[PDB]
Amino acid sequence: APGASKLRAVLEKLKLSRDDISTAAGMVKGVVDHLLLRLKCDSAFRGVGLLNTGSYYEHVKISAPNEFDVMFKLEVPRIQLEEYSNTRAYYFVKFKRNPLSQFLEGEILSASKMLSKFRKIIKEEINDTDVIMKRKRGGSPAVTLLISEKISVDITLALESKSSWPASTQEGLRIQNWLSAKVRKQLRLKPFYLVPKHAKGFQEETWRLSFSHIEKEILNNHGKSKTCCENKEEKCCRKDCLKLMKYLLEQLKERFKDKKHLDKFSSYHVKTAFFHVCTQNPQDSQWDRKDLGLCFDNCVTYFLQCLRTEKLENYFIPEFNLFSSNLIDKRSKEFLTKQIEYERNNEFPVFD
Amino acid sequence: GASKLRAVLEKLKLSRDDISTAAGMVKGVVDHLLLRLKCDSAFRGVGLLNTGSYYEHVKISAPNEFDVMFKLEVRIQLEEYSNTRAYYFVKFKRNPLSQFLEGEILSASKMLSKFRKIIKEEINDIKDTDVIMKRKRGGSPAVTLLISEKISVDITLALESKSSWPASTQEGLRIQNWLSAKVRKQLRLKPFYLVPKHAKEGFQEETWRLSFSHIEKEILNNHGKSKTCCENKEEKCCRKDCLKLMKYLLEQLKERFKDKKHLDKFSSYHVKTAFFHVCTQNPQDSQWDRKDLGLCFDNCVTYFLQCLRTEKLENYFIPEFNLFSSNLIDKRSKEFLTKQIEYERNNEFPVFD
Numbered sequence: 001a002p003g004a005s006k007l008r009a010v011l012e013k014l015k016l017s018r019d020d021i022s023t024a025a026g027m028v029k030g031v032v033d034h035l036l037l038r039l040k041c042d043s044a045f046r047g048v049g050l051l052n053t054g055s056y057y058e059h060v061k062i063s064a065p066n067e068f069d070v071m072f073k074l075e076v077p078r079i080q081l082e083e084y085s086n087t088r089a090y091y092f093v094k095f096k097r098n099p100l101s102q103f104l105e106g107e108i109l110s111a112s113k114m115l116s117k118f119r120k121i122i123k124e125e126i127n128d129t130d131v132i133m134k135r136k137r138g139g140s141p142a143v144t145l146l147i148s149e150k151i152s153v154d155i156t157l158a159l160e161s162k163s164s165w166p167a168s169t170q171e172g173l174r175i176q177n178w179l180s181a182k183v184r185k186q187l188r189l190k191p192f193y194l195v196p197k198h199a200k201g202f203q204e205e206t207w208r209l210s211f212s213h214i215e216k217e218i219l220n221n222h223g224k225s226k227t228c229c230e231n232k233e234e235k236c237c238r239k240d241c242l243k244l245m246k247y248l249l250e251q252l253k254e255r256f257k258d259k260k261h262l263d264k265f266s267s268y269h270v271k272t273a274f275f276h277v278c279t280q281n282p283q284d285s286q287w288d289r290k291d292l293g294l295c296f297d298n299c300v301t302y303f304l305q306c307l308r309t310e311k312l313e314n315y316f317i318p319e320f321n322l323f324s325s326n327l328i329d330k331r332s333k334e335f336l337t338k339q340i341e342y343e344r345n346n347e348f349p350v351f352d
Numbered sequence: 353g354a355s356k357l358r359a360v361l362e363k364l365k366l367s368r369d370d371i372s373t374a375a376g377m378v379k380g381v382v383d384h385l386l387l388r389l390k391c392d393s394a395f396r397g398v399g400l401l402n403t404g405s406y407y408e409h410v411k412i413s414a415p416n417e418f419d420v421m422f423k424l425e426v427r428i429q430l431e432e433y434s435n436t437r438a439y440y441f442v443k444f445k446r447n448p449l450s451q452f453l454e455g456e457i458l459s460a461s462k463m464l465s466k467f468r469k470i471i472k473e474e475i476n477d478i479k480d481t482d483v484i485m486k487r488k489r490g491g492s493p494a495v496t497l498l499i500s501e502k503i504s505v506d507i508t509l510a511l512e513s514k515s516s517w518p519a520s521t522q523e524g525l526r527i528q529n530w531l532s533a534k535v536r537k538q539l540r541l542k543p544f545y546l547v548p549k550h551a552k553e554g555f556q557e558e559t560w561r562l563s564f565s566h567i568e569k570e571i572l573n574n575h576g577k578s579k580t581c582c583e584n585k586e587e588k589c590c591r592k593d594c595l596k597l598m599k600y601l602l603e604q605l606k607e608r609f610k611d612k613k614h615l616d617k618f619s620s621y622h623v624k625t626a627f628f629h630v631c632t633q634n635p636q637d638s639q640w641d642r643k644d645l646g647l648c649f650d651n652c653v654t655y656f657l658q659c660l661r662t663e664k665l666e667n668y669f670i671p672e673f674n675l676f677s678s679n680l681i682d683k684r685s686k687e688f689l690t691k692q693i694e695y696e697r698n699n700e701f702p703v704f705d
């Protein structure tokens with residue numbers, strides 16, 4: 001059936017912003033490189049570095065040309081984790097043995113003291129850029145840089161641990177039938193990350209698991225075939241389906257911006273649902289470009305099924321339901337369901 | 353005739369337990385050496401490389417003999433020797449190894465002597481172990497450890513360089529159609545290694561030779577176009593079994609004819625290099641179906657014979673370096689191996705009986 005041409009028109013429109021996203025990224029890289037070189041001089045942040053994560057390095061940044069999000073990794077001594085209240089994603093951080101001694105509150109690493117020093121040094125080194133404290137986000141992102149005219153950068157601190165992944169991830173990352181058990185094992189040997197994030201008042205000394213570096217690797221190396229999307233015979237529509245899924249939600253959220261019905265929904269929900277769609281459809285032949293219309297339709301349908309059943313487990317932490325009623329109320333999911341179904345039934349007028 | 357090739361593969365597995373037990377004994381001795389070496393200021397950054405046929409799962413000979421590479425992280429400047437493409441003098445830009453300098457170049461002889469002396473002193477404190485200075489191998493391997501009753505291990509020292517690969521590698525590693533250009537670029541961001549190896553003029557004694565054994569392992573242990581190659585019944589291929597059979601056939605021919613020197617210069621590295629070229633020429637997993645093992649091995653043998661007849665076998669990473677040059681292997685050797693392999697193939701490999 002006709003319709004995919006409208007999806008292609010949207011993908012063409014998104015490509016027009018590539019050069020403006022590239023020139024603003026080059027300015028961000030300049031400020032960020034200078035920030036890190038000054039941060040490494042502090043004894044607590046000597047092991048600081050740049051994590052090459054986010055939609056920009058995944059080549060799926062499809063809105064906000066002057067809004068970037070960057071992660072600063074910090075290598076830590078051997079970390080011991082203590083799960084917080086069976087949340088499977090939030091942990092207290094302890095140490096087996098230390099430059100971060102000043103930030104201990106008892107025996108746990110205080111996220112409050114780490115953010116305070118992080119925000120203080122950044123404000124001191126920024127002193128054509130200004131700094132803004134990022135509030136109402138639980139600590140991640142911590143700050144927002146304002147660079148030159150209208151460029152903003154959200155900066156997130158992330159502890160790096162080279163230890164085995166926590167037990168709560170043992171059944172996650174179900175890529176064996178898609179990218180192979182060998183790749184799974186190699187991914188699980190990479191470090192994992194922890195960002196400061198309070199858990200709901202709130203417990204303010206918790207850290208949350210982050211696998212943004214794994215998400216980027218899978219997105220940029222997404223086929224069963226190693227030569228997927230490298231020649232005309234092996235072009236797939238995986239990345240374009242993710243792009244359109246993120247664009248659909250962003251255009252809907254802009255459409256209903258004044259009311260908070262879609263406030264709790266995030267590009268991470270679409271990203272997580274997409275990874276599960278890839279697990280359920282591991283063969284490259286199921287993602288052929290001539291079926292771009294079909295594939296996007298099945299992606300929308302899968303995300304619709306997640307909202308109706310109120311189930312969307314974290315791809316890495318299967319016991320963590322991103323769609324739990326403690327996080328997103330039923331009426332919000334029903335509202336998003338109705339609007340997406342309307343769009344799908346009318347060839348997506350949001351894309352006009 | 354493919355059933356006899358399967359019989360060989362079956363009988364090769366009987367030695368897996370003996371290989372594993374000896375490998376564990378080697379590891380314990382090797383770990384004691386690395387701890388002693390890391391105490392010296394010149395070798396503070398020494399580490400184990402984990403390469404060779406054991407870690408590639410294609411070890412087919414000498415269950416009690418192993419090859420081990422100690423890597424040493426070094427910012428070096430390379431100066432190619434006599435346009436050889438593979439042999440280099442090592443200089444430094446802008447130093448823990450300054451005791452091994454002779455003028456501006458890093459001396460392989462001076463570094464090997466200190467390497468041998470530390471290992472020899474750390475071995476005298478380990479029971480049922482002795483060390484031998486390896487001769488006539490040009491410095492690599494440097495020593496041979498004797499362990500317990502019949503275990504021996506060759507130890508090679510290797511400088512690690514995290515800089516860009518040398519220009520002689522620019523058009524090597526032609527895996528784009530097989531393992532993808534994305535993987536090729538990832539492999540080339542890894543370090544390269546240099547082993548001490550004298551060059552024939554070996555008459556020039558301060559050269560180092562490029563080594564990519566870590567890259568050969570990655571390819572062999574991740575060999576399919578499909579990431580799930582050999583991970584399920586639908587995607588079982590015969591690539592590694594073909595390599596094992598090629599290695600076994602050459603080794604068996606060398607041992608059968610060791611009373612003469614006709615085959616002394618041939619090495620398993622020649623078979624492995626030809627195999628990588630076979631993989632480049634046949635990139636699809638479908639061309640390596642396990643039901644066609646007899647045909648696949650026959651085509652591998654055929655390709656190796658063609659290299660022998662044409663006297664052409666480029667180093668897989670350095671395409672201008674011909675391993676089958678007349679400066680390295682006499683035409684008489686190639687002719688004798690050709691005739692022997694042809695006779696074997698014609699009568700269903702009686703060498704395996």
Ligand SMILES: O=C(O)[C@@H]1CCCN(c2nc3ccccc3n3cccc23)C1
Pocket residue numbers: 089140195208209210211266268269314320322
């Ligand atoms: O990891 C991050 O911080 C990324 C940037 C912020 C958004 N995001 C999320 N990651 C989560 C990781 C574990 C549990 C819940 C998560 N979650 C719930 C809503 C949004 C997220 C992705």
Ligand SMILES: O=C(O)[C@@H]1CCCN(c2nc3ccccc3n3cccc23)C1
Pocket residue numbers: 438492547561562563564619621622667673675
């Ligand atoms: O590199 C080593 O030392 C490995 C262990 C010894 C065997 N070998 C060879 N590598 C070479 C690398 C560049 C040029 C010629 C090479 N060559 C010629 C005959 C055998 C080799 C592999």
Ligand SMILES: [Zn+2]
Pocket residue numbers: 222223228229234235236237238
């Ligand atoms: Zn693709």
Ligand SMILES: [Zn+2]
Pocket residue numbers: 575576581582587588589590591
């Ligand atoms: Zn295979």
